[PDB]
Write an enzyme that holds these catalytic residues in place. Structure first.
Site, mmCIF file in Angstrom:
data_model
loop_
_atom_site.group_PDB
_atom_site.id
_atom_site.type_symbol
_atom_site.label_atom_id
_atom_site.label_comp_id
_atom_site.label_asym_id
_atom_site.label_seq_id
_atom_site.Cartn_x
_atom_site.Cartn_y
_atom_site.Cartn_z
ATOM 1 N N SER A 40 4.262 2.719 7.790
ATOM 2 C CA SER A 40 3.938 1.480 7.954
ATOM 3 C C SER A 40 4.158 0.724 9.405
ATOM 4 C CB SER A 40 5.274 0.597 7.322
ATOM 5 O OG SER A 40 4.569 0.623 5.854
ATOM 6 N N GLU A 136 -0.571 6.761 2.676
ATOM 7 C CA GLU A 136 0.584 7.042 3.701
ATOM 8 C C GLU A 136 0.253 8.441 4.468
ATOM 9 O OE1 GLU A 136 1.811 4.051 3.145
ATOM 10 O OE2 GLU A 136 3.225 4.065 4.954
HETATM 11 C C1 LIG Z 1 10.847 1.678 3.701
HETATM 12 C C2 LIG Z 1 9.785 1.278 3.704
HETATM 13 C C3 LIG Z 1 8.928 0.884 4.458
HETATM 14 C C4 LIG Z 1 9.631 0.366 5.730
HETATM 15 O O1 LIG Z 1 10.582 0.359 5.838
HETATM 16 O O2 LIG Z 1 8.808 -0.031 6.779
HETATM 17 N N1 LIG Z 1 7.777 0.723 4.603
HETATM 18 C C5 LIG Z 1 6.663 0.566 3.257
HETATM 19 C C6 LIG Z 1 5.853 1.838 3.721
HETATM 20 C C7 LIG Z 1 5.699 2.045 5.034
HETATM 21 O O3 LIG Z 1 6.276 2.766 5.749
HETATM 22 N N2 LIG Z 1 6.188 3.033 2.968
HETATM 23 C C8 LIG Z 1 5.584 3.307 1.848
HETATM 24 O O4 LIG Z 1 4.873 2.949 1.191
HETATM 25 C C9 LIG Z 1 6.016 4.980 1.486
HETATM 26 C C10 LIG Z 1 7.409 4.906 1.023
HETATM 27 C C11 LIG Z 1 7.990 4.414 -0.042
HETATM 28 C C12 LIG Z 1 9.392 4.243 -0.250
HETATM 29 C C13 LIG Z 1 10.298 5.344 0.383
HETATM 30 S S1 LIG Z 1 8.801 5.531 1.623
HETATM 31 S S2 LIG Z 1 7.457 0.711 1.839
HETATM 32 C C14 LIG Z 1 9.304 1.377 2.440
#
Ligand SMILES: CC1=C(C(=O)O)N[C@@H]([C@@H](C=O)NC(=O)Cc2cccs2)SC1
Length: 253
Positions: A40, A136
């Site tokens: 992210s 991702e």
């Molecule tokens: C934890 C988290 C974040 C963040 O802290 O920035 N971002 C969103 C995204 C970006 O890294 N991650 C995902 O979509 C993949 C994951 C989902 C749940 C645990 S990792 S969703 C989950």
């Protein structure tokens, strides 16, 4: 540093570190050119590109979307399918909550992953590799970047000349008021020091944070702390990032 090596030991992880004091050009680095999934953290650079493409008034354009545009994590977007959301609201949701659907919606508006990559190449980023929506294994190059490349690109948009001042202000403010990074870089920075950050999390226990950090007084530090682990289903520990940040601040102070 052996301190960074100790943290890799302590947390059973691989660490990627690049920090730049913009006032002195002094540097801290550990695996700075090693590739990690950006996760992210890319949302920060995506808004950078959006801001570069739209006047501030253009951000008030209402985007309509469907339940189909919703993905795995939609904290703000799930609440507004009927009314839609403005580009400005989507940027806020993406940066301060890491709303995945918001990022996808914005990415669509800037022309997709291929368009984002092109704009990043335009600002001088030849390593960051956007390829898929959301996004991702080890060690493929999509969707990856390095600690060095991420601070360089973040600095370019937020602190240098890839954006005009008013748009710079918007990006910095959203990142300053991020809700998702209290236990990461923010936790490794001294009291009363402003932090603007964007977090990331992903498979192989990937846990990232990129930030600009302001001293009481003086020029900002820009930092990337990236991390990953052996197994696909491995869990991460936020403390790794906080502790790595303490090590970085010690080596700069
Ligand atoms: C934890 C988290 C974040 C963040 O802290 O920035 N971002 C969103 C995204 C970006 O890294 N991650 C995902 O979509 C993949 C994951 C989902 C749940 C645990 S990792 S969703 C989950």
């Amino acid at each position: 540093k052996d301190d960074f090596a100790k943290l890799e030991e302590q947390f059973d992880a691989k660490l990627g570190i690049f920090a730049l004091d913009t006032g002195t050009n002094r540097t801290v680095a550990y695996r700075p050119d090693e590739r990690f999934a950006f996760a992210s953290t890319i949302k920060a650079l995506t808004v950078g590109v959006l801001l570069q493409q739209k006047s501030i008034e253009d951000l008030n354009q209402r985007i309509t979307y469907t339940r189909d545009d919703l993905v795995n994590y939609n904290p703000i977007t799930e609440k507004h399918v009927d009314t839609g959301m403005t580009l400005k609201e989507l940027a806020d949701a993406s940066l301060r909550y890491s709303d995945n659907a918001a990022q996808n919606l914005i990415l669509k508006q800037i022309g997709g992953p291929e368009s984002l990559k092109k704009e990043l190449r335009k600002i001088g980023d030849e390593v960051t590799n956007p390829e898929r929506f959301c996004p991702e294994n080890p060690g493929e190059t999509q969707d990856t970047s390095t600690a060095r490349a991420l601070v360089t690109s973040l600095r370019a948009f937020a602190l240098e000349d890839k954006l005009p001042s008013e748009k710079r202000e918007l990006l910095i403010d959203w990142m300053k008021r991020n809700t998702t990074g209290d236990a990461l870089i923010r936790a490794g920075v001294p009291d009363g020091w402003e932090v603007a950050d964007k977090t990331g999390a992903a498979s192989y226990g990937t846990r990232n944070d990129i930030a600009i950090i302001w001293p009481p007084k003086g020029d900002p530090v820009v930092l990337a702390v990236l991390s990953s682990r052996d197994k696909k289903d491995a869990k991460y520990d936020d403390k790794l990032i906080a502790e790595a940040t303490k090590v970085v601040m010690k080596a700069l102070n």
